[PDB]
A paper describes a structure:
From the CHS-supplemented dataset 1 with no malate and dataset 2 with 10 mM malate, we unequivocally identified CHS densities in the lateral fenestrations and phospholipid (PL) densities in the pore (hereinafter called as “pore lipid”) in two classes. The only difference observed between the datasets 1 and 2 was the presence of a malate density in the pore of the dataset 2. In the CHS-supplemented datasets 1 and 2, we identified two distinct classes in the sterol mimic-bound state: “sterol 1” when one pore lipid tail of the sterol mimic (CHS) is in the fenestrations and “sterol 2” when two pore lipid tails of the sterol mimic (CHS) are in the fenestrations. Unexpectedly, we observed that the succinate head group of CHS interacted with several residues. Since the succinate group was the key structural moiety to differentiate CHS from native cholesterols, these interactions were likely to present artificial features and to inhibit pore lipid expulsion (described later). Similarly, the succinate head group of CHS in the lower fenestrations occupied the S3 region interacting with W120, Y208, and R226. These observations indicate that phosphate groups of PL and the dicarboxylic moieties (malate and succinate head group of CHS) compete with each other for malate binding sites S0, S1, and S3. Additionally, the TMD of the sterol mimic-bound classes is similar with those of the pore lipid-bound and peripheral lipid-bound classes, suggesting that plant sterols may contribute to the regulation of the clade 2 ALMTs.
Among the different ion transporters and ion channels localized in the vacuolar membrane, the ion channels of the aluminum-activated malate transporter (ALMT) family play a key role for the transport of chloride and malate during stomata opening/closure. ALMTs are also involved in transporting various anion including chloride, nitrate, fumarate, tartrate, citrate, and malate. Here we report the cryo-EM structures of ALMT9 from Arabidopsis thaliana (AtALMT9), a malate-activated vacuolar anion channel, in plugged and unplugged lipid-bound states.
Author numbering:
A (entry chain A), B (entry chain B): 80 to 278, 298 to 434, 527 to 570
The structure:
């Protein structure tokens, strides 16, 4: 609330500050009777132009400006091509409204068509207003010019109070998310083993749903200038996305491992207490490796001159040896109820899932090496 | 586009129709010079009051009306308690704007606080306008009354053109979604078995993400009157949600089964070709049962006087017998590389997952029976 995210306390304040500034400006002007009654547009612009991050603000401003200008020009021209049709100037002014409304509503229901929705809305609004009002090219331009000088003040105050007072970036957000994802999967892999051997959802149910957010953060960050520890005009951000994509593949195996614990068919504790010492070592080595990788990502450091996938591999090999030398406790070998014979293969399923998780750890290391190459990570 | 969802072609048209009607109305009035320049509010209301479904429209209208009235009253009173503070009437009018902006921004960043965001926005807008304009209780009420009679026309035309011209309901949407979810999981369970035995994502990746949509549809439907095949003042809709919740539990097992096919460690075809005939029967029986349940839900019919969980159970028992009489091909029993010994337990994992899926099918039947009881399904 007040400690989970300090940024939420600075953004709001910024907003308030902007509003105050606008008010002060309107108070500094002389007693103009037409500068005080059109002040609801500056307030609307001030509260509608703010965005959390710099890249999102920049993209929204660019798109909105282009769409507003295009729609305004086309809607001003299409209400002047309509006064020369002749005597068909009262069925056309009734068919056009219907067609424009239909097109505007149609363009909004399809997610694919989302960059051109705003322009269409602006065109619909402007065209309908000009026709129903009774205005003429000369009587509408004066109103536009009169009520656009209180829109540009709000737009430039909102744009001045965001890029120079505690700027908030998106690349840092992506970096923090990646770190928290390595740490969530490391914190869940231990809890699944402990939950199986004792007689774990927040880490595998946050990494798998964090693809759309990563894509949006990357899209926002591609609209930002060089700053701080990120010095370049083409900074590799898809190499950060690829690492999370690789980690999600392992998080799926952790998902299956947790789901094993929630089945109707379960094995007895006395049969699962034979592999406790073998499972614990893998469950600790995997988490250690994941935390080491997360920390290296956080500090922006290249991998050392020592192999990092040795201890987990040795632990997996030992587990495989123990399984091979104890397989008689998993299947019924005297026939070479069904529930009794099916409750013993759960251990085999769990061990196979753990081995699959261990084997899926090379792609993460490969992605990290590639990222460190393209981003110029400092030597250890 | 034009055939995937016919409703998308009727809604838009409705919108256009509403707009046309409004235009016609404004044209029917005499040449009023103040009834034509305030016509951008009726258009804004017309395009802002439309919703796809009836329940969503009703809920939004209720919430917006209450919040608008509350905020308008409080913002009219708080700009009249401010002219009696005395000589501290110019630092208070600067501190209040900042505080109000801070509070409005704070109330928006928290998803929990979402029913009271609109009222706060309205209060902020009204208070800031009254202060910066220079208005008095008597000079603002006249403007409000003048520009609210073109807002109520748009609101009642949008509300009249939606509830009586091709009404669209949400309960039908929930019903169709449930049916398509039973059919997606039935279409994926077959493709996972065929993909494993040959030498399947749309059905298990649509059911698991359809919980928020079901909750929203249920919330919207609780705001609708009796109609058609749904005749009651308290219609059980959470009993429809519970069935999908039960089916998702099995869809997770189908997820694991599909994920088995995408592992680095795979078994040889010659070893997996021994259980083909046993796996095919279960893969067909499960889909048949799921499709039977989906069809019964679609037609609103009670279950017959014959057990529906017999064939799948018999198939699972046969698979368990075959596994018990062929287990020597899964493990190395001569020690009572690691990859060779670990590539043979994949069959055991797949069979265990399939048996778990088969066992998780009683909860779905139980939920369907309960729903048919509370919803009064017709006898077969
Ligand atoms: C923001 C409204 C505050 C409360 C207003 C009191 C109720 C008045 C009744 C009349 C209805 C007018 C308010 C309806 C607003 C439309 C809702 C909406 O879709 O907006 C998105 C968005 C609301 O979406 P939401 O966040 O999901 O609630 O913002 C708005 O509410 C209105 C945004 C318009 C402000 C732009 C003004 C800047 C000057 C130049 C404008 C040129 C473009 C004009 C086209 C703007 C299209 C909106
Ligand atoms: C002609 C150029 C060289 C100088 C002037 C450019 C302006 C015409 C542009 C710059 C930023 C634009 C604004 C960018 C963002 C918005 C908010 C935008 O917000 C919405 O569209 C509603 C909310 C939403 O859609 O999310 C409404 C128009 C507006 C004020 C734009 C109006 C036109 C502005 C002032
Ligand atoms: C309705 C008929 C009779 C007249 C034509 C309707 C126009 C209002 C449409 C047609 C083309 C549209 C434009 C098509 C291309 C663009 C560029 C487009 O580029 C982007 O996508 C910006 C970057 C991004 O955000 O992805 C921004 C909006 C805009 C100007 C659109 C605004 C609305 C326009 C002018
Ligand atoms: C080449 C140019 C023409 C492109 C950019 C034009 C825009 C700046 C236009 C498009 C729509 C115009 C707006 C259209 C509708 C209105 C509302 C209109 O509202 C009223 O009805 C005033 C009277 C009242 O509300 O009582 C006042 C002007 C204004 C804000 C206009 C301001 C200028 C806008 C944003
Ligand atoms: C006093 C009672 C007995 C009769 C009059 C009630 C009206 C004051 C209510 C009924 C419906 C209300 C409208 C309901 C829906 C909207 C759309 C609403 O949309 C938005 O809030 C912007 C878009 C969004 O937030 O999604 C803006 C106010 C408005 C027009 C409301 C204005 C107040 C209205 C007309
Ligand atoms: C800022 C300070 C100095 C003055 C008080 C601010 C008000 C504008 C707040 C305080 C209580 C708020 C109200 C609290 C309770 C409700 C009922 C609330 O009920 C619902 O939740 C409707 C059903 C739903 O959609 O869930 C609808 C909005 C409203 C009137 C809120 C509108 C905004 C209010 C009046
Ligand atoms: C007990 C009552 C007072 C509760 C309901 C009051 C609402 C109907 C009020 C709240 C805010 C009011 C609006 C406040 C701001 C405006 C914009 C204002 O815009 C102008 O600045 C007109 C001149 C111009 O735009 O050039 C015109 C009146 C209007 C729509 C008001 C219409 C009536 C509203 C919606």
């Amino acid at each position: 609330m007040g400690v989970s995210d300090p940024r939420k306390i600075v953004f709001s304040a910024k907003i308030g500050l902007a509003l105050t500034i606008v008010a002060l400006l309107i108070f500094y002007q002389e007693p103009n009777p037409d500068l005080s009654r059109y002040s609801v547009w500056a307030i609307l612009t001030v509260v509608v132009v703010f965005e959390f991050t710099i890249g999102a603000t920049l993209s929204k401003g660019f798109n909105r400006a282009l769409g507003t200008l295009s729609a305004g020009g086309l809607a001003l021209g299409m209400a002047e091509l309509s006064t020369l049709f002749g005597d068909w100037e009262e069925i056309f002014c009734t068919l056009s409204i219907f067609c424009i409304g239909f097109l505007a509503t149609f363009m909004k229901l399809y997610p694919s068509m989302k960059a051109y929705e705003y322009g269409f809305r602006v065109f619909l609004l402007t065209y309908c207003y000009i026709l129903i009002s009774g205005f003429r090219t000369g009587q509408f331009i004066e109103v536009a010019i009169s009520r656009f000088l209180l829109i540009a003040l709000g737009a430039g105050v909102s744009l001045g109070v965001n890029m120079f007072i505690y700027p908030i970036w998106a690349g840092e957000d992506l970096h923090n998310l990646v770190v928290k994802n390595f740490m969530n999967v490391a914190t869940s892999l231990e809890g699944c083993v402990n939950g199986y051997l004792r007689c774990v959802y927040k880490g595998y149910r946050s990494a798998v749903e964090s693809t759309s957010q990563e894509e949006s953060l990357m899209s926002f960050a591609i609209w930002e200038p060089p700053h701080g520890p990120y010095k370049s005009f083409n900074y590799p951000w898809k190499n950060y996305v690829k690492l999370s994509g690789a980690l999600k593949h392992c998080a799926f195996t952790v998902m299956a491992l947790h789901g094993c614990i929630l089945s109707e068919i379960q094995a007895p504790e006395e049969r699962r207490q034979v592999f406790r010492q073998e499972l614990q070592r893998v469950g600790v080595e995997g988490a250690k490796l994941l935390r080491e990788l997360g920390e290296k990502v956080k500090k922006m450091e290249k991998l050392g001159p020592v192999d990092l996938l040795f201890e987990v591999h040795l632990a997996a090999e030992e587990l495989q040896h123990k399984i091979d030398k104890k397989s008689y406790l998993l299947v019924n070998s005297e026939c070479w109820k069904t529930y009794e014979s099916a409750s013993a293969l759960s251990l085999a399923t769990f061990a196979s899932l753990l081995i699959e998780f261990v084997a899926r750890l090379q792609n993460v290391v490969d992605a990290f090496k590639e990222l460190s190459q393209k981003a110029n990570f400092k030597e250890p």
